[PDB]
Amino acid sequence: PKVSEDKNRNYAVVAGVVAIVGSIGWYLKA
Amino acid sequence: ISATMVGALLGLGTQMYSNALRKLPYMRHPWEHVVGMGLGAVFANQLVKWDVKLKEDLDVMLAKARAANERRY
Amino acid sequence: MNTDITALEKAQYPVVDRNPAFTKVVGNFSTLDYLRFSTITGISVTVGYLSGIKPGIKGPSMVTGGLIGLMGGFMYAYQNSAGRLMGFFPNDGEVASY
Amino acid sequence: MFNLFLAVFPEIFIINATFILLIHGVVFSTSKKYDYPPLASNVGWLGLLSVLITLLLLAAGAPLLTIAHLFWNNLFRRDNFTYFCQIFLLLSTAGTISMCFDFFDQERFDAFEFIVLILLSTCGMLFMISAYDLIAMYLAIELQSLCFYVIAASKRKSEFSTEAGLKYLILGAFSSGILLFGCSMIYGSTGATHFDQLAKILTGYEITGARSSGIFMGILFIAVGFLFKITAVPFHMWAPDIYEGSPTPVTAFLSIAPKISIFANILRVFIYGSYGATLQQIFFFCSIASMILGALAAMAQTKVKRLLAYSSIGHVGYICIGFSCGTIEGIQSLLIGIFIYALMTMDAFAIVLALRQTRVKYIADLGALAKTNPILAITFSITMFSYAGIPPLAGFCSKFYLFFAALGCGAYFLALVGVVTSVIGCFYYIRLVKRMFFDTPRTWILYEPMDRNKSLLLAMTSFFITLFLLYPSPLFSVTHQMALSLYL
Amino acid sequence: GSKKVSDRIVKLSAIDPDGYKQDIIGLSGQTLLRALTHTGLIDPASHRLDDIEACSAECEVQIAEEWLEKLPPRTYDEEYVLKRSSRSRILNKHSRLGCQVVLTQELQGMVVAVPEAKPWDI
Amino acid sequence: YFNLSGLILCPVLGSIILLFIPNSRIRLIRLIGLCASLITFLYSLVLWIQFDSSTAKFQFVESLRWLPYENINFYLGIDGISLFFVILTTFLIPICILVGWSGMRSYGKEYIIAFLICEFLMIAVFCMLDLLLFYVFFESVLIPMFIIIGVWGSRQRKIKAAYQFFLYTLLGSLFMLLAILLILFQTGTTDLQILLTTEFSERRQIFLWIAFFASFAVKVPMVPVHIWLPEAHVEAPTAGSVILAGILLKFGTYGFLRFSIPMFPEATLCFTPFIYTLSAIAIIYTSLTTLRQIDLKKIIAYSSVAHMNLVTIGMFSLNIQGIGGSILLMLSHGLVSSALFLCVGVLYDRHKTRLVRYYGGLVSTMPNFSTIFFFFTLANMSLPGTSSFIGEFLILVGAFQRNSLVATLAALGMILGAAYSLWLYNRVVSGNLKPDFLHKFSDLNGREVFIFIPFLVGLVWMGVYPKVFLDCMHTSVSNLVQHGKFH
Amino acid sequence: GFIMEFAENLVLRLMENPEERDRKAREHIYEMHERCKKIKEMWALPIR
Amino acid sequence: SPTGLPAQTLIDRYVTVGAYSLLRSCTIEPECIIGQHSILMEGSLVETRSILEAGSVLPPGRRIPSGELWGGNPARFIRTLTNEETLEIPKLAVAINHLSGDYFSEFLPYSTIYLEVEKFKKSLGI
Amino acid sequence: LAQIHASENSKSFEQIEVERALRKKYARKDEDYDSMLGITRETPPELILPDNVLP
Numbered sequence A: 001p002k003v004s005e006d007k008n009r010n011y012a013v014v015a016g017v018v019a020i021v022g023s024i025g026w027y028l029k030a
Numbered sequence B: 001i002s003a004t005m006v007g008a009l010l011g012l013g014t015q016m017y018s019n020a021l022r023k024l025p026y027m028r029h030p031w032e033h034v035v036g037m038g039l040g041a042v043f044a045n046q047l048v049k050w051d052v053k054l055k056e057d058l059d060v061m062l063a064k065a066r067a068a069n070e071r072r073y
Numbered sequence C: 001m002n003t004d005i006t007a008l009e010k011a012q013y014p015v016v017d018r019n020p021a022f023t024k025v026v027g028n029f030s031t032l033d034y035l036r037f038s039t040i041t042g043i044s045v046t047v048g049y050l051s052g053i054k055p056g057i058k059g060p061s062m063v064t065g066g067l068i069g070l071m072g073g074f075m076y077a078y079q080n081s082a083g084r085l086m087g088f089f090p091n092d093g094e095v096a097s098y
Numbered sequence D: 001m002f003n004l005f006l007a008v009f010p011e012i013f014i015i016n017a018t019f020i021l022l023i024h025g026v027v028f029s030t031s032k033k034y035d036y037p038p039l040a041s042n043v044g045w046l047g048l049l050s051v052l053i054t055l056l057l058l059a060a061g062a063p064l065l066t067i068a069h070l071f072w073n074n075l076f077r078r079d080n081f082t083y084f085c086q087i088f089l090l091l092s093t094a095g096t097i098s099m100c101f102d103f104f105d106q107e108r109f110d111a112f113e114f115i116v117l118i119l120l121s122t123c124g125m126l127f128m129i130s131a132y133d134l135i136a137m138y139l140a141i142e143l144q145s146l147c148f149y150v151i152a153a154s155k156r157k158s159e160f161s162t163e164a165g166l167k168y169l170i171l172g173a174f175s176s177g178i179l180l181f182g183c184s185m186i187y188g189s190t191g192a193t194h195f196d197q198l199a200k201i202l203t204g205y206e207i208t209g210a211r212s213s214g215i216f217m218g219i220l221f222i223a224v225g226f227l228f229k230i231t232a233v234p235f236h237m238w239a240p241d242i243y244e245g246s247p248t249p250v251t252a253f254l255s256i257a258p259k260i261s262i263f264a265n266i267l268r269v270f271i272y273g274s275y276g277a278t279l280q281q282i283f284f285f286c287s288i289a290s291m292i293l294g295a296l297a298a299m300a301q302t303k304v305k306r307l308l309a310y311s312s313i314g315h316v317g318y319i320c321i322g323f324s325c326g327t328i329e330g331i332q333s334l335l336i337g338i339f340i341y342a343l344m345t346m347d348a349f350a351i352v353l354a355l356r357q358t359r360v361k362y363i364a365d366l367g368a369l370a371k372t373n374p375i376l377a378i379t380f381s382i383t384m385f386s387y388a389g390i391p392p393l394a395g396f397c398s399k400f401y402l403f404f405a406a407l408g409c410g411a412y413f414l415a416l417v418g419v420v421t422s423v424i425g426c427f428y429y430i431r432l433v434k435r436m437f438f439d440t441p442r443t444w445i446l447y448e449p450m451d452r453n454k455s456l457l458l459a460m461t462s463f464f465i466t467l468f469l470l471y472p473s474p475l476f477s478v479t480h481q482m483a484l485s486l487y488l
Numbered sequence E: 001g002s003k004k005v006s007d008r009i010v011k012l013s014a015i016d017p018d019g020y021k022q023d024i025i026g027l028s029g030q031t032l033l034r035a036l037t038h039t040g041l042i043d044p045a046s047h048r049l050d051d052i053e054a055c056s057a058e059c060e061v062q063i064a065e066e067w068l069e070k071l072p073p074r075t076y077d078e079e080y081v082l083k084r085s086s087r088s089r090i091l092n093k094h095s096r097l098g099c100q101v102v103l104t105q106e107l108q109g110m111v112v113a114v115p116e117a118k119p120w121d122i
Numbered sequence F: 001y002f003n004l005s006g007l008i009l010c011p012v013l014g015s016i017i018l019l020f021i022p023n024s025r026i027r028l029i030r031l032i033g034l035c036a037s038l039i040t041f042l043y044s045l046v047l048w049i050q051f052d053s054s055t056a057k058f059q060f061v062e063s064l065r066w067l068p069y070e071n072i073n074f075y076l077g078i079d080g081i082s083l084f085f086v087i088l089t090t091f092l093i094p095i096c097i098l099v100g101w102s103g104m105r106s107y108g109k110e111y112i113i114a115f116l117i118c119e120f121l122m123i124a125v126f127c128m129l130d131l132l133l134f135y136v137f138f139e140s141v142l143i144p145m146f147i148i149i150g151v152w153g154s155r156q157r158k159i160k161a162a163y164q165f166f167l168y169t170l171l172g173s174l175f176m177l178l179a180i181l182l183i184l185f186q187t188g189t190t191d192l193q194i195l196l197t198t199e200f201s202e203r204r205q206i207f208l209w210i211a212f213f214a215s216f217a218v219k220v221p222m223v224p225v226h227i228w229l230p231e232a233h234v235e236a237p238t239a240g241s242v243i244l245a246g247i248l249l250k251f252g253t254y255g256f257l258r259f260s261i262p263m264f265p266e267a268t269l270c271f272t273p274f275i276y277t278l279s280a281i282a283i284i285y286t287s288l289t290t291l292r293q294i295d296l297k298k299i300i301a302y303s304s305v306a307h308m309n310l311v312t313i314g315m316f317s318l319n320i321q322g323i324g325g326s327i328l329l330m331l332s333h334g335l336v337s338s339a340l341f342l343c344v345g346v347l348y349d350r351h352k353t354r355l356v357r358y359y360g361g362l363v364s365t366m367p368n369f370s371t372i373f374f375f376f377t378l379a380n381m382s383l384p385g386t387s388s389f390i391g392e393f394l395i396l397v398g399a400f401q402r403n404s405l406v407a408t409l410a411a412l413g414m415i416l417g418a419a420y421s422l423w424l425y426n427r428v429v430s431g432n433l434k435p436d437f438l439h440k441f442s443d444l445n446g447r448e449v450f451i452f453i454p455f456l457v458g459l460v461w462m463g464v465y466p467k468v469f470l471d472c473m474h475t476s477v478s479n480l481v482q483h484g485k486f487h
Numbered sequence G: 001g002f003i004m005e006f007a008e009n010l011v012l013r014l015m016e017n018p019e020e021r022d023r024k025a026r027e028h029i030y031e032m033h034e035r036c037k038k039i040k041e042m043w044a045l046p047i048r
Numbered sequence H: 001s002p003t004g005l006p007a008q009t010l011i012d013r014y015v016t017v018g019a020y021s022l023l024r025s026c027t028i029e030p031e032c033i034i035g036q037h038s039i040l041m042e043g044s045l046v047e048t049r050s051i052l053e054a055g056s057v058l059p060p061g062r063r064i065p066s067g068e069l070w071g072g073n074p075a076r077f078i079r080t081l082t083n084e085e086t087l088e089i090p091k092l093a094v095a096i097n098h099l100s101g102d103y104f105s106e107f108l109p110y111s112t113i114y115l116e117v118e119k120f121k122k123s124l125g126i
Numbered sequence I: 001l002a003q004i005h006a007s008e009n010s011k012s013f014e015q016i017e018v019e020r021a022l023r024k025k026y027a028r029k030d031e032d033y034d035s036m037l038g039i040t041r042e043t044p045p046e047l048i049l050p051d052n053v054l055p
Ligand SMILES: CCCCCCCCCCC(CCCCCCCCCC)(CO[C@H]1O[C@@H](CO)[C@H](O[C@@H]2O[C@@H](CO)[C@H](O)[C@@H](O)[C@@H]2O)[C@@H](O)[C@@H]1O)CO[C@H]1O[C@@H](CO)[C@H](O[C@@H]2O[C@@H](CO)[C@H](O)[C@@H](O)[C@@H]2O)[C@@H](O)[C@H]1O
Pocket: B001, B002, B003, B006, B007, B010, B011, B039, B040, B041, B043, B044, B047, B048, B049, B051, B052, B055, B056, D467, D468, D470, D471, D473, F065, F070
């Protein structure tokens, strides 16, 4: 029990977190 | 009344309105309630700014139209 | 072909580089442009992921949404960068380099 | 060579996204690995995303869309009015798409081509608003009309949909034939099709010294075609049947988006139709007839969608009142009424699709709704009162300023007919409130709850309608800017 | 005394458009359409309500001559529904709404001719 | 700094809090609704303390923009007249909550929502100087009254009652709206201070006066249009029916004072005999119609119609005392008619007959109700020493000073008022007791006993010492009478 | 203290300056009447 | 059912069933308070506005007429309902609904037992 | 009749979730797109009751 072991969901999760980071930056940097 | 308390209150109110209109208890998901408050505040502030800009760019165009009319003679 | 780029509403800001090149405006992407080009792609990828779980297309729907979001985000970044270059946007970062 | 395309830039994105959606939905709806998935909700969500993205692309580039205007002059001219019309048409389309999601699951209607055709019709409408010619206008009208004919009869094994689709097809083709005859017969008598060169040779001389039969007859034919498109009495031969037979999500989109684009076309045509003796009186008479017939025909209607269709016809008549004035305030009232009617129609069709879960057909099915679902009951009552023009709501401001514009031109006969029709329409609007607050039938029908899309759209629209007369300044200012931008 | 349900039982002879006789069972005091509903030969989802305003001849049933003189006739709109929502804009003089016909104890053995079901979806 | 904004906000907060309260918590709903209503009443009372009854101009004003060019906007304020109407509106609503207090479990929270909505709605009507928005809130009260009449109507025939009350109002409303459009297009704005200082055309004056009279003759029951009030008023809940004659009946009559008399100085003079010949025959015809009536509710409504037709005479008779007497009579009627409908509704909430034939000999039992009913009948009987007589004596004085004929016909009204009200009193609570129909019955408990206490004290106070009411508004009436002319 | 000292002062501070009220009403009337002519001339503009 | 009607049991609005009521293939009209220990059997019908007293038992194919009070070991008439008491049925059902809603808010969705599942499973093996 | 209740009450977690998803997928039918795609959808055997308990 150390790795999610799903080579399809992890890309979606990293896309979601980078989307959140982009949103917070767009609010801040603009 | 500062265009933000009204916006936050309206966002929270429409969140409970949507939540209870499906026959659910009003405070189902507090997180979407707080994000609705944030979105309502943002939309209200942007609406006020857009109204100010609309009036500002409408006056400078109505003046042009009136000047164009006034050159009849 | 005879082309003539000219805006009816003239640029309010300095009008450096009236007709920039494609690779030039591509290379002018500031940090904000990259940020807004990435957030749209991320939103599109996650929407394609979440929408495609009921039909069972777990990944290919995410890829299609990624294509749509990538095209849209690049289009938005190009639009902002070019509009800044032709002048009719608040530059404050191009006159400094020019 | 590439920066010239920033003017038509959002349309390129929506076309490319439609193509990508079509490819995805045809590749992955036939694969045996995923045993033929429905692939309708997925395509719908991706299409809603694409519409939102192109809306952002269109809105942010407000100073854009004007560069290389000489290059695009012969094809389309998009001024400030076009931008504000397109940004609203995209919003209405996105609202309708978000509305028609639960219909794709509970009804089990999994045809992804529905969303693709809606997107193509949206692109046709976008091409229509900026269509500054007699050719681009017709091409865009046909482009939306084909998608509408196809999606009106989308449900094949049903019987009302196909019949309504056929009648809509015949009426639309007949209208297009008349409009094209008018366009040709004004081209042959003037030699020009572009609006700049059409508003220059007949603007200063219409019937003053003499007249030409060809140009007047062609203008009349164009007006007849446009009235056929908006279903104004007496050019409303089969519209209620189309509203009945067509699937409810389709008629939600068929009565909001097309009217905005057609009215933009009429406004753009009015800048050259300076005759004043061929366009204003015909629309005046058609407005009077439409109000009268809608008010006296929706009274007898016992179904729900038929009543909505006739109410829409009456609202089109009230809308035409503001255009009959032919002044800046008239056009402003026109645009305000269009916006209010679009929002209220979105509200009503959100209600109807919400009640579609248990197959609501007649007005009496929703009886005793004040007890089972009191909140939906009060929301629908507010929507009906907004239709009635009851003062403390949106939908009264539009009729108010419409009547004010009508009195601005001194058309006192229009005001009295408007008052009579408003009273008559208010009666059968409140008749619905009676059927669901006061009268309690022996048999009750229970309605299952809705989804978050319809609920959220409904809440937003209901708060907009009630709380509009406290802060109406932005809409008035934007509509005055739009009307003033029509000519300069 | 004991108030058995069997006292208010009304039996009819509904015939499908396929020419098959059916022995349906209804109740005295309720609508004839409700009686036709238990058998299922008429789709219950089509005519869920018993109101006259919510009728579009989807409850239309054809009645023999010998049963038409012992029940009240069409008053003002029972005929209107027939002469509005029909392929031919004319009355049959042998048809009646099943929604408006209430079943009485003496109305046993009544034969009703249910026609072909018309579309009712939208 | 107790301004007018809070007076309108407080009912809005009360309604908003009630919206998100579960139906199970019936204990909290009534408590918080009554508390909000009483806070509104106190906030209205404190305005009377800081009224400053000296200036001709308007009191505390709040301006909120409504159009992009500030062409027309929300412009609050009271001068000398709408103040008392605001106070009485804020006072009647808590009585409405208290009367419908016991049976709130069936009513639910939606009962208080409508009442508080109408509460701040009628508050926003009286203090609204802008002419158009005065019409927006003038017809905004359609929805709450429609809902109150329909949802919680007594009998099943309420469906037809509400339709008349609605459509009759809409017809005149839109007829007024056309005049408002004509005025705005001609003048340019609808602010009251400016619009009173615009030279009008005499031919235009008559048409606009007629257009205003199209609706204002419906709110006050006139001869051609008074059918709606009895049919749509006998068939409303007691808590709701007590403000159809309480505040919903004073819009048009008060609308004459603010938007007709100073607005059209040269048209009211030309149309004075028409109003006289309408109201004088109204006070006779309606009073005669009252005699041959059997329902207990309809007689009080007809008496109210007669009282309004009487006050209309004294209002259009332009006198410094005629208008003041009109306002006193309107306040007194708002008290007495409200009290009378509560008195005849407490009988209905126990027996549910609404017929004088069944009622009889109710002095041998429930004597406290008999005493209260006798006092309020005397108040309606137009006796000196009560606030009414102060009301119509000034009306008669103002009418006689102008026209001798109209005063005699008007006083025929107070002569004929002793024919139906006293007959009802002696036929309901002083007849022979019959145990066949009224088998058993109780008396007033602590709720309805306390309900009539403010009514009684206000009645006596404004009857024996009406000085403060006249003191607070002599300036405004003087300014209203002297307008347009300079002699 | 006594009720006069606790009531007269509160009333006279709540009255809020009658003269300034009349002045404000006067300039409000003047300003809005001036804006009225501007609105009328705004409406006088032809469509073309 | 013996009556020949469809045997599905349907309970209409504002119907109070009462504890230990053994319904089986019955049919209940709206506003039909049912007392405790009720043995409604196959094909039994209850007309609207009626009250059934506690302990009542009725055989199959037995009906209760419109608003009227019954009870006893067999289906036995008791008295006729008065107008004042026959409107207390909907209020009673509404009050029970209020109390049920009071219980409803007590527990949130998606109970936290799974955490205890994991905690107890972690004690041994996997 | 008892055996179907016996089987349903004794289903593992990894199995009951699968049956729930399958029941959700086949809750409603659509002959239109099924005929247009050239496919047919048959309910899984695990979602069909034995014919002995049907009326
Ligand atoms: C739907 C329910 C309505 C219920 C409430 C109705 C009551 C509305 C009044 C509440 C309210 C917010 C509106 C909320 C809208 C709701 C949005 C709904 C969707 C939300 C999910 C509008 O109040 C003012 O807003 C002004 C905006 O223009 C307008 O003033 C006219 O404008 C001129 C234009 O040319 C006219 O020429 C002129 O005649 C008037 O001056 C008027 O609208 C009004 O005076 C509060 O005021 C807010 O607006 C402004 C100015 O105060 C403030 O921002 C300012 O920005 C800078 C300069 O902009 C300033 O440097 C800065 O100092 C300040 O920060 C806000 O901080 C806040 O104060």
